[PDB]
Design an enzyme around this catalytic site. Structure first.
Site, PDB file in Angstrom:
ATOM      1  N   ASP B  36       0.847  -1.180   0.000  1.00  0.00           N
ATOM      2  CA  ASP B  36       0.000   0.000   0.000  1.00  0.00           C
ATOM      3  C   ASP B  36       0.888   1.236   0.000  1.00  0.00           C
ATOM      4  O   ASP B  36       1.703   1.421   0.911  1.00  0.00           O
ATOM      5  CB  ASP B  36      -0.919  -0.025   1.216  1.00  0.00           C
ATOM      6  N   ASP B  39      -0.554   4.298   3.600  1.00  0.00           N
ATOM      7  CA  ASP B  39      -1.383   3.627   4.597  1.00  0.00           C
ATOM      8  C   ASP B  39      -2.029   4.583   5.590  1.00  0.00           C
ATOM      9  O   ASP B  39      -2.597   4.124   6.586  1.00  0.00           O
ATOM     10  CB  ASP B  39      -0.562   2.565   5.348  1.00  0.00           C
ATOM     11  N   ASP B  41      -4.327   6.692   4.237  1.00  0.00           N
ATOM     12  CA  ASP B  41      -5.508   7.033   3.450  1.00  0.00           C
ATOM     13  C   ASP B  41      -6.094   5.729   2.932  1.00  0.00           C
ATOM     14  O   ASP B  41      -5.474   5.064   2.094  1.00  0.00           O
ATOM     15  CB  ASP B  41      -5.146   7.966   2.296  1.00  0.00           C
ATOM     16  N   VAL B  44      -6.646   4.568  -0.888  1.00  0.00           N
ATOM     17  CA  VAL B  44      -5.460   4.328  -1.704  1.00  0.00           C
ATOM     18  C   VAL B  44      -5.012   2.897  -1.444  1.00  0.00           C
ATOM     19  O   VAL B  44      -4.610   2.566  -0.325  1.00  0.00           O
ATOM     20  CB  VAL B  44      -4.331   5.321  -1.373  1.00  0.00           C
ATOM     21  N   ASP B  54      -5.600   9.968 -11.181  1.00  0.00           N
ATOM     22  CA  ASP B  54      -4.310  10.052 -10.494  1.00  0.00           C
ATOM     23  C   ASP B  54      -3.497  11.252 -10.970  1.00  0.00           C
ATOM     24  O   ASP B  54      -2.276  11.172 -11.127  1.00  0.00           O
ATOM     25  CB  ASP B  54      -3.503   8.761 -10.670  1.00  0.00           C
ATOM     26  N   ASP B  58      -1.113   8.823  -6.618  1.00  0.00           N
ATOM     27  CA  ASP B  58      -1.193   7.489  -7.220  1.00  0.00           C
ATOM     28  C   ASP B  58      -2.142   6.619  -6.392  1.00  0.00           C
ATOM     29  O   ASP B  58      -1.735   5.913  -5.468  1.00  0.00           O
ATOM     30  CB  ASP B  58       0.207   6.891  -7.313  1.00  0.00           C
ATOM     31  N   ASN B  62       0.124   1.752  -8.572  1.00  0.00           N
ATOM     32  CA  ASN B  62       0.752   1.066  -9.683  1.00  0.00           C
ATOM     33  C   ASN B  62       1.881   1.883 -10.291  1.00  0.00           C
ATOM     34  O   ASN B  62       2.400   1.518 -11.347  1.00  0.00           O
ATOM     35  CB  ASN B  62      -0.291   0.720 -10.731  1.00  0.00           C
ATOM     36  N   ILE B  64       1.836   4.711 -11.719  1.00  0.00           N
ATOM     37  CA  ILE B  64       1.417   5.543 -12.840  1.00  0.00           C
ATOM     38  C   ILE B  64       0.524   6.648 -12.292  1.00  0.00           C
ATOM     39  O   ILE B  64      -0.509   6.376 -11.669  1.00  0.00           O
ATOM     40  CB  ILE B  64       0.694   4.716 -13.912  1.00  0.00           C
ATOM     41  N   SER B  94      -0.817 -24.567   1.686  1.00  0.00           N
ATOM     42  CA  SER B  94       0.608 -24.418   1.930  1.00  0.00           C
ATOM     43  C   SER B  94       1.427 -24.490   0.650  1.00  0.00           C
ATOM     44  O   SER B  94       2.559 -23.999   0.623  1.00  0.00           O
ATOM     45  CB  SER B  94       1.076 -25.492   2.915  1.00  0.00           C
TER      46      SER B  94
HETATM   47  C1  LIG Z   1      -1.072  10.244   1.462  1.00  0.00           C
HETATM   48  O1  LIG Z   1      -2.450  10.517   1.703  1.00  0.00           O
HETATM   49  C2  LIG Z   1      -2.722  11.768   2.364  1.00  0.00           C
HETATM   50  C3  LIG Z   1      -4.220  11.894   2.444  1.00  0.00           C
HETATM   51  O2  LIG Z   1      -4.703  11.267   3.623  1.00  0.00           O
HETATM   52  C4  LIG Z   1      -2.100  12.932   1.597  1.00  0.00           C
HETATM   53  O3  LIG Z   1      -2.247  14.075   2.423  1.00  0.00           O
HETATM   54  C5  LIG Z   1      -2.979  15.132   1.787  1.00  0.00           C
HETATM   55  O4  LIG Z   1      -2.133  15.787   0.914  1.00  0.00           O
HETATM   56  C6  LIG Z   1      -2.751  16.873   0.199  1.00  0.00           C
HETATM   57  C7  LIG Z   1      -1.664  17.458  -0.667  1.00  0.00           C
HETATM   58  O5  LIG Z   1      -1.926  17.172  -2.031  1.00  0.00           O
HETATM   59  C8  LIG Z   1      -3.332  17.906   1.173  1.00  0.00           C
HETATM   60  O6  LIG Z   1      -4.162  18.784   0.426  1.00  0.00           O
HETATM   61  C9  LIG Z   1      -4.156  17.258   2.278  1.00  0.00           C
HETATM   62  O7  LIG Z   1      -4.385  18.197   3.315  1.00  0.00           O
HETATM   63  C10 LIG Z   1      -3.408  16.082   2.880  1.00  0.00           C
HETATM   64  N1  LIG Z   1      -4.233  15.417   3.876  1.00  0.00           N
HETATM   65  C11 LIG Z   1      -3.889  15.365   5.163  1.00  0.00           C
HETATM   66  C12 LIG Z   1      -4.851  14.666   6.080  1.00  0.00           C
HETATM   67  O8  LIG Z   1      -2.844  15.861   5.571  1.00  0.00           O
HETATM   68  C13 LIG Z   1      -0.626  12.671   1.353  1.00  0.00           C
HETATM   69  O9  LIG Z   1      -0.041  13.701   0.571  1.00  0.00           O
HETATM   70  C14 LIG Z   1      -0.479  11.359   0.617  1.00  0.00           C
HETATM   71  N2  LIG Z   1       0.911  11.126   0.275  1.00  0.00           N
HETATM   72  C15 LIG Z   1       1.278  10.355  -0.746  1.00  0.00           C
HETATM   73  C16 LIG Z   1       2.754  10.258  -1.013  1.00  0.00           C
HETATM   74  O10 LIG Z   1       0.457   9.765  -1.429  1.00  0.00           O
HETATM   75  C1  PLM Z   2      13.389 -35.139  12.935  1.00  0.00           C
HETATM   76  C2  PLM Z   2      12.725 -35.534  11.618  1.00  0.00           C
HETATM   77  C3  PLM Z   2      13.019 -34.533  10.512  1.00  0.00           C
HETATM   78  C4  PLM Z   2      12.015 -33.406  10.452  1.00  0.00           C
HETATM   79  C5  PLM Z   2      11.562 -33.139   9.066  1.00  0.00           C
HETATM   80  C6  PLM Z   2      10.454 -32.142   9.050  1.00  0.00           C
HETATM   81  C7  PLM Z   2       9.090 -32.789   9.115  1.00  0.00           C
HETATM   82  C8  PLM Z   2       8.131 -32.109   8.203  1.00  0.00           C
HETATM   83  C9  PLM Z   2       7.670 -30.797   8.796  1.00  0.00           C
HETATM   84  C10 PLM Z   2       6.872 -29.998   7.836  1.00  0.00           C
HETATM   85  C11 PLM Z   2       5.556 -30.677   7.499  1.00  0.00           C
HETATM   86  C12 PLM Z   2       4.359 -29.816   7.811  1.00  0.00           C
HETATM   87  C13 PLM Z   2       3.813 -29.105   6.583  1.00  0.00           C
HETATM   88  C14 PLM Z   2       2.417 -28.573   6.802  1.00  0.00           C
HETATM   89  C15 PLM Z   2       1.468 -28.877   5.654  1.00  0.00           C
HETATM   90  C16 PLM Z   2       0.013 -28.316   5.830  1.00  0.00           C
HETATM   91  O1  PLM Z   2      -0.331 -28.002   7.017  1.00  0.00           O
HETATM   92  O2  PLM Z   2      -0.657 -28.240   4.750  1.00  0.00           O
HETATM   93 CA    CA Z   3      -1.929   4.963 -10.700  1.00  0.00          CA
HETATM   94 CA    CA Z   4      -3.974   3.132   1.788  1.00  0.00          CA
END
Ligand SMILES: *[C@@H]1O[C@H](CO)[C@@H](O[C@@H]2O[C@H](CO)[C@@H](O)[C@H](O)[C@H]2NC(C)=O)[C@H](O)[C@H]1NC(C)=O
Ligand code: PLM
Ligand code: CA
Ligand code: CA
Ligand SMILES: *[C@@H]1O[C@H](CO)[C@@H](O[C@@H]2O[C@H](CO)[C@@H](O)[C@H](O)[C@H]2NC(C)=O)[C@H](O)[C@H]1NC(C)=O
Ligand SMILES: *[C@@H]1O[C@H](CO)[C@@H](O[C@@H]2O[C@H](CO)[C@@H](O)[C@H](O)[C@H]2NC(C)=O)[C@H](O)[C@H]1NC(C)=O
Ligand code: MYR
Ligand code: MYR
Ligand code: DAO
Lengths: 118, 406
Positions: B36, B39, B41, B44, B54, B58, B62, B64, B94
């Site tokens: 993310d 984090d 906002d 996003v 965007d 962004d 991604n 872009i 697993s």
């Molecule tokens: C991350 O998100 C926050 C929004 O929560 C962005 O903060 C805003 O930035 C703009 C500037 O373009 C301001 O107008 C807003 O006041 C800001 N909001 C807050 C709550 O401060 C922040 O810029 C973002 N950063 C990135 C890198 O995406």
């Molecule tokens: C002392 C003997 C040697 C020990 C070798 C390791 C034994 C195998 C341990 C990993 C097996 C468990 C995998 C989990 C699979 C699942 O939960 O889908």
């Molecule tokens: Ca984008």
């Molecule tokens: Ca976010």
């Protein structure tokens, strides 16, 4: 409490400790310290690693040093619990000696407590 | 649960916190959905139609935005109006979230301080790597294949789609529980562009850990009910002109066939543990992600593949008959056999398509080959889904470059 997941986790960590000692031809203690030094301080990983050495390290050393495998260790420390009746879960092949006798040895190796922690 | 252990209390608590501070909170980080751009906002966000083209801000993120000084026309209007932008949305499990345990974390022979640098982030994302997934991945593939995710191919076809991805996937998601998090889907009927929605519940309806997993598998009757609820929900939130694609389920017998004799990462040092031994271990504990397929019991593997085929046919039948006002519906075979063939044409072995540590999930290579098959099959049979190439793509790049990145 111990369940299927704690058992997987103990076997994993002990295996890595064992193989790290083997690769660097080092003690188990130096292997655990090396593993904890590899871990980041983030999320308390390195700290947790050192809480585990504190709580379980001496017995992992005692058992691995007697050439017990990760299955033996995790059963001795009760991360893996075999209900009476149910079958035995083990990741590595059962040792040369029988399991029942191998596990009795293991329990006796950690029952000894020549060192107290205050 | 692992977090019952007292020694893990502090790290479990800190993992929970980090997840909460992301803004199912993880589903909002940029690994899962387009970042993310503002984090402060709430008007996003990616995917919305541009507010006042965007000319100042962004509003759809991604990259872009603004006005061309030559003719006073807004760039978003000159470059994107008429191009029919659209978003990509995955409802997955697993595999769609790309669950991955790194072999580097558990293989001592190559372990070092460098190995665990990515561990904390993986733990706060449930060991999922959506930023590398086949549907919504946007980072450079850590593997050696040119193929890109569905999202990036969509951006390539029309640069105005930058950042319009959402991976709504959970480990353990199925048709039964999708309603518990489908609310994290963000799309507004009136303000937003249409979306491509992929429904990929590819395992957990037949995958279970119980000793007797056949009774736990979803039935075709219940699946039809669950999916119709999901589609009725999507029809009330997708803009007119959307497209929904239902994926069938895999024939999961490729796992055992290709892996049972291979060594697991923990067994490669001493050649003393195969995937067969791991599967047996996990089933004895009832914590296998898929007892049905990860088992030496060939009868059980067949019953699982049989139910998956029935469920797949239900989805195929829903796609041919059911109609909705705001989107049309399509069905797609998982078709892993064709993935294997494409890999083998590149010199690959099938076992190299599975996550080494769990012996169950598709790895990054496989997910990218699934995305390539999706793209070629859709482009051939249903070209309307993907829209037209934007003639102004070169002028978008010349004025806006990388459009802000991800
Ligand atoms: C991350 O998100 C926050 C929004 O929560 C962005 O903060 C805003 O930035 C703009 C500037 O373009 C301001 O107008 C807003 O006041 C800001 N909001 C807050 C709550 O401060 C922040 O810029 C973002 N950063 C990135 C890198 O995406
Ligand atoms: C002392 C003997 C040697 C020990 C070798 C390791 C034994 C195998 C341990 C990993 C097996 C468990 C995998 C989990 C699979 C699942 O939960 O889908
Ligand atoms: Ca984008
Ligand atoms: Ca976010
Ligand atoms: C690897 O470490 C091992 C430790 O087990 C070393 O082997 C032992 O070395 C001492 C030599 O002082 C002897 O007491 C032992 O008998 C050796 N063997 C065993 C089984 O303990 C070995 O030296 C180290 N290797 C290298 C290349 O340094
Ligand atoms: C192999 O798997 C099949 C399918 O789960 C097992 O057969 C079923 O076992 C359950 C017992 O939990 C019964 O309710 C069914 O009646 C059985 N069906 C069939 C077709 O046998 C079978 O027991 C498994 N074999 C082994 C050796 O575990
Ligand atoms: C010896 C004490 C170590 C126990 C704590 C270590 C746990 C490490 C990860 C556990 C793996 C979880 C298994 C699973 O997900 O099924
Ligand atoms: C030498 C001791 C090594 C122990 C390493 C295990 C501790 C660190 C990893 C634990 C990760 C657990 C995360 C979770 O519970 O989800
Ligand atoms: C050997 C220590 C590093 C191993 C970390 C691998 C991931 C840990 C197990 C994942 C399961 C969980 O965290 O719940």
């Amino acid at each position: 409490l111990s369940n299927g997941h704690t058992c997987v986790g103990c076997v994993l960590v002990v295996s890595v400790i064992e193989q790290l000692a083997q690769v660097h031809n080092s003690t188990v203690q130096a292997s655990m310290e090396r593993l904890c030094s590899y871990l980041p301080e983030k999320l308390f990983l390195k700290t947790t690693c050192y809480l585990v050495i504190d709580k379980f390290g001496s017995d992992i050393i005692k058992l691995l040093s007697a050439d017990m495998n990760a299955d033996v260790v995790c059963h001795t420390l009760e991360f893996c619990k075999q209900n009476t009746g149910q079958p035995l879960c083990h990741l590595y092949p059962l040792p040369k000696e029988t399991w029942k006798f191998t596990l009795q040895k293991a329990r006796q190796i950690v029952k000894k407590s020549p060192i107290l922690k205050y | 649960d692992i977090c019952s252990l007292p020694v893990l209390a502090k790290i479990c608590q800190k993992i929970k916190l980090a997840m909460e501070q992301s803004v199912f909170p993880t589903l909002r980080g940029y690994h899962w959905r387009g970042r993310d751009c503002n984090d402060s906002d709430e008007s996003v966000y990616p995917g919305r139609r541009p507010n006042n083209w965007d000319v100042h801000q962004d509003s759809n993120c991604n990259g872009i935005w603004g006005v061309d000084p030559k003719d006073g026309v807004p760039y978003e209007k000159k470059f994107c109006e008429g191009s029919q932008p659209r978003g990509i949305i995955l409802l997955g499990d697993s595999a769609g979230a790309h669950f991955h345990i790194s072999p580097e974390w558990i293989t001592a022979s190559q372990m070092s301080l460098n190995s665990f640098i990515n561990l904390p982030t993986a733990l706060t994302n449930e060991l999922d790597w959506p930023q590398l997934s086949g549907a919504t991945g946007f980072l450079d593939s850590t593997v050696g294949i040119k193929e890109k995710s569905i999202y990036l191919r969509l951006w390539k076809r029309n640069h105005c789609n930058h950042r319009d991805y959402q991976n709504i996937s959970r480990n353990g998601a199925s048709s039964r529980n999708l309603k518990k998090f489908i609310e994290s889907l963000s799309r507004n009927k009136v303000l937003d562009y249409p979306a491509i929605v992929i429904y990929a519940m590819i395992g957990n309806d037949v995958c279970s850990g119980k000793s007797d997993p056949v009774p736990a598998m979803t039935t075709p009757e219940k699946l039809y009910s669950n999916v119709m609820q999901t589609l009725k929900h999507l029809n009330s939130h997708l803009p007119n002109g959307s497209h929904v694609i239902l994926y069938g389920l895999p024939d999961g017998t490729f796992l055992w066939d290709n892996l049972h004799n291979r060594y697991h990462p923990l067994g490669q040092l001493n050649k003393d543990m195969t995937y067969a031994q791991l599967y047996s271990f996990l089933n004895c504990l009832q914590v296998s992600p898929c007892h049905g397929w990860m088992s030496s019991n060939k009868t059980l593997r067949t019953l699982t593949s049989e139910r998956a085929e029935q469920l797949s046919n239900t989805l195929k039948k829903i796609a041919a008959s059911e109609k909705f006002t705001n989107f049309n519906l399509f069905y797609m075979d998982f078709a892993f056999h064709e993935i294997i063939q494409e890999w083998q044409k590149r010199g690959g072995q099938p076992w190299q398509l599975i996550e080494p540590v769990d012996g169950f999930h598709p790895n990054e290579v496989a997910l990218l080959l699934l995305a390539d098959h999706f793209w070629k099959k859709v482009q051939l049979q249903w070209p309307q889904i993907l829209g037209k190439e934007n003639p102004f793509n070169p002028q978008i790049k010349q004025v806006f470059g990388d459009q802000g990145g991800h």
